[PDB]
Design a protein around this ligand. Structure first.
Ligand SMILES: NCCC[C@H](NCC(=O)O)C(=O)O
Ligand SMILES: [Cl-]
Ligand SMILES: [Cl-]
Ligand SMILES: [Cl-]
Ligand SMILES: [Cl-]
Ligand SMILES: [Cl-]
Ligand SMILES: [Cl-]
Ligand SMILES: [Cl-]
Ligand SMILES: [Cl-]
Ligand SMILES: [Cl-]
Ligand SMILES: [Cl-]
Length: 256
């Protein structure tokens, strides 16, 4: 490898989005360029809609995916992943005036890898509270997968982009959403969004998988080996931590 093409969504701030000049910016872009410098490879970022981001990788339209993509078991059946470059729990989003905010959280950190009757009881409590509540999620996400598999009795609307989800929540067309803390914290930290609040347990594992990684074709074992060495070095020297604070306003970097 001398040169690779990396796909990103271009509409998932602060991971990947467009600046005032329409240039691709974000945590994914800065990290991607940093990892490619360590691998001594020419880096080109391209914009790709979330819908066909995985089949365009397997079809050879580009060489990698850096688009806030969770290393989830369903995706591992189709593509390979690098080592996680970011770890993030998942939580719920609603309006600041919502009665949903007064709900008691019995389990602050909820792992989904081996759901106990206690963990299931907490999941069922939230499922029953979310009955009658209109939920909105971006289509093709682990957020949609969680709602369909874990909370099927909850009415959900799916969207092309996360920006349309946020728009409809602020407009009052939906009552709640679900995304990672890495997306929801910088969003709710904005003075623009003081009318929006995070709530409920912070969930990890299960269908959400084990962090955010680089999507690579399964046959490209050498490119994965290069990315894994570059990510381990970027984590060790504190580059991931620095970019996490810069873009997310907190440290979401993994530990060695
Ligand atoms: N359109 C990007 C959504 C990415 C999503 N990752 C969760 C998240 O980082 O909020 C997923 O893996 O499904
Ligand atoms: Cl966004
Ligand atoms: Cl081809
Ligand atoms: Cl990614
Ligand atoms: Cl309230
Ligand atoms: Cl509370
Ligand atoms: Cl979503
Ligand atoms: Cl329903
Ligand atoms: Cl939409
Ligand atoms: Cl609401
Ligand atoms: Cl929370």
């Amino acid at each position: 490898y001398k040169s690779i093409t990396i796909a990103t969504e271009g509409s998932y701030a602060p991971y990947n989005f467009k600046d005032a000049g329409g240039k691709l910016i974000g945590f994914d872009i800065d990290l991607g360029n940093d990892l490619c410098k360590r691998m001594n490879i020419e880096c080109k970022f391209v914009e790709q809609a979330w819908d066909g981001i995985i089949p365009s990788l397997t079809a050879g339209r580009y060489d990698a995916i850096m688009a806030a993509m969770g290393i989830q078991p369903a995706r591992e059946k189709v593509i390979a992943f690098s080592r996680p470059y970011l770890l993030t729990p998942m939580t719920f989003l609603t309006t600041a005036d919502s009665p949903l905010l007064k709900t008691q959280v019995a389990i602050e950190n909820l792992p989904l890898d081996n759901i106990t009757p206690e963990q299931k009881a907490e999941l069922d409590k939230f499922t029953k509270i979310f009955e009658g509540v209109k939920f909105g999620v971006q289509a093709g996400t682990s957020h949609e997968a969680f709602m369909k598999q874990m909370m099927p009795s909850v009415q959900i609307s799916t969207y092309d982009t996360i920006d349309n989800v946020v728009m409809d929540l602020k407009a009052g067309r939906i009552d709640a959403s679900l995304a990672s803390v890495s997306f929801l914290k910088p969003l709710t930290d904005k003075p623009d969004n003081k009318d929006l609040k995070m709530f409920g347990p912070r969930m990890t594992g299960g269908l959400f998988g084990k962090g955010v990684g680089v999507g690579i074709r399964k046959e490209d074992a050498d490119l994965k080996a290069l990315f894994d060495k570059a990510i381990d070095a970027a984590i060790a020297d504190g580059t991931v931590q620095k970019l996490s604070q810069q873009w997310f306003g907190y440290d979401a970097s993994p530990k060695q």
